[PDB]
């Protein structure tokens, strides 16, 4: 199938991670550690080492499915798009909220989706949209972390990813 790829940085990805994974049409969601100073860092190099990286979830879809506009607007469901480095409790840069992708044709669509979604808040958004620089996936036991762990932690409500895109 016709697949493409965006990352995408809305807090603790554990959440954000099992939200994509429930969406029709979303083939693959890997969790881990993008746009940061260093190269291949660990879960501890990124939260206590200040490596600079944000925990960020490379979303793969079907592109005959989904189109990368679907996907912006299932992100924006669930991520507080005004709030600088913070996503629910979680605080730092690692939570900072952003868009980033490998195509240079995809800027300027998700500025568009930005700047339509700017009319929903009185604050002002402070998404970022820019190059993906790095990524690097994060260790095992992070990848389907609410699946093993259905107890475990999470500011998304992941059953809204099932909320058909009006």
Known sequence: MNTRTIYLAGGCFWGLEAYFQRI???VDAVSGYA????????????SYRHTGHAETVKVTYDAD??????ILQYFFRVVDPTSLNKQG????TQYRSGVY???????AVIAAALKREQQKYQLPLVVE???????????EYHQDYLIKNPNGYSHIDIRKADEPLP
Request: charged share 35%; net charge negative; aromatic share 10%.
């Open 65 to 70: 499915k989904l189109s990368l506009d679907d």
């Open 89 to 92: 409790n979680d605080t730092g």
């Open 35 to 46: 746009n940061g100073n260093t190269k291949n860092p660990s879960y501890e190099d990124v």
């Open 101 to 107: 992708y490998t195509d240079p044709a995809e800027k």
């Open 129 to 139: 949209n820019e190059p993906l620089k790095n990524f690097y996936d994060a260790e």
């Open 24 to 26: 029709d049409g979303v």
